[PDB]
Structure 1
Amino acid sequence: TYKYVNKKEQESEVDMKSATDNAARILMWTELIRGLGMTLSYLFREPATINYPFEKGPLSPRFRGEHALRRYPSGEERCIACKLCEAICPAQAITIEAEPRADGSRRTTRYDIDMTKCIYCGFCQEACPVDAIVEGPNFEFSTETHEELLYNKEKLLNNGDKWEAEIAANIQADYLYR
């Protein structure tokens, strides 16, 4: 099904009345005045902006935001170094090397997410079997120096501890969907 836009169905022959109406349109800028009315109208509408520090634009539970590594309620970090979070990262951001901890458990000696390399796809959130690496809600982590953006296990684990309460609520809300 098609539709002609800007196709004049027929040649309306000028009638004085028509001509006057048109000539008035050119002479007294009638349509231009129409446009001014629209903007005056909004001037009276409530502005949609938010006080950025005081009010925040709404983000729902799946917002990917900033990486964090979670821990079991007991206190044992969730990651067991299966290293498929490294395998599926599209940007090669996550670097993981592991060795059996003294307890005998499997754990990662080094877990480094290069956030400048990361493109926040959220697949790592997807891939983890124990769901140790999660996309945390915080988006405000702008840093003065490039090195700060590179994150080792201690920053991510600390990021995990700080935001665990909200991360748990967010995962709680969206897990049925996944």
Structure 2
Amino acid sequence: TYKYVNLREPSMDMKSVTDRAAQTLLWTELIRGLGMTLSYLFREPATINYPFEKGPLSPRFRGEHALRRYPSGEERCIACKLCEAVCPAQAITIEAEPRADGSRRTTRYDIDMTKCIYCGFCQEACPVDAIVEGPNFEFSTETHEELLYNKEKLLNNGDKWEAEIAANIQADYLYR
């Protein structure tokens, strides 16, 4: 099914021709456009007062990465390397070895945040909720090097943001 967007014949009676002449000489349709911008002048603007006000986000929001713990404080990550395997950008680098107590844990967990595409595939692939994209999006830096995250930086992000991360997971985990 289709419709025509511009298949019409102007009427050629005197009243119609004189209507179009007046539009030509009195600029009536231009004056009409002025009316619409005038109406916007008296509308309340949509601007929010950043940084005192923030744009709304959802619990699914994909922001800065963090490494998480169990309630005991033990690391969740068990160096399975599923995140590294799935990462579309090859932004994750992992090394692991038996910990002094025999635990399977990483000795390296790096995320190049300038390779990362913030796709969230790592947190989908993780079987233990160890790596997540947190809610923080305000972490711009003055140097390139500051965006090469190692395990210490990522654990500190987990400890810094866990209060919010856990609540967001609580809201969305039944959708996963």
Structures share fold, TM-score greater than 0.5: yes
Counterpart residue number, 2:63 = 65
Shift of 1:139: 0.5
Shift of 1:19: 1.2
When the two chains are superposed, the root-mean-square deviation of aligned CA atoms in Å is 0.8
CA contact (8 A) 2:68 2:75 kept: yes
Shift of 1:14: 1.3
Residue 74, structure 1, aligned to residue 72, structure 2:
yes
Q: Under a length normalisation based on structure 1, what TM-score does the superposition of the two structures give? A: 0.96
Runs (4+) off by over 6 Å: none
CA distance in 2, matches of 1:17, 1:36: 25
Q: 1:13 to 1:80 in 2, by over 3 A?
A: closer
* Per-residue CA distance 1:25-63 (angstroms, 9 max, x = gap): 000000000100000001111000111110000010000
Shift of 1:13: 4.4
Count of residue pairs the alignment pairs up: 175
CA distance in 1, matches of 2:36, 2:126: 53
Identity percentage over the alignment? 94
CA distance in 1, matches of 2:11, 2:112: 71
CA distance in 1, matches of 2:81, 2:17: 78
Q: Secondary structure at the match of 1:97?
A: strand
Shift of 1:11: 3.9
Counterpart residue number, 1:52 = 50
Q: 1:61 to 1:14 in 2, by over 3 A?
A: same
Q: Flag structure 2 segments of 5+ consecutive residues without an equivalent.
A: none
Shift of 1:15: 1.2
CA contact (8 A) 2:87 2:122 kept: yes
* Per-residue CA distance 1:91-135 (angstroms, 9 max, x = gap): 000000000000100000010000000000001010000010001
Q: Flag structure 1 segments of 5+ consecutive residues without an equivalent.
A: none
CA contact (8 A) 2:11 2:17 kept: no
CA contact (8 A) 2:59 2:168 kept: yes
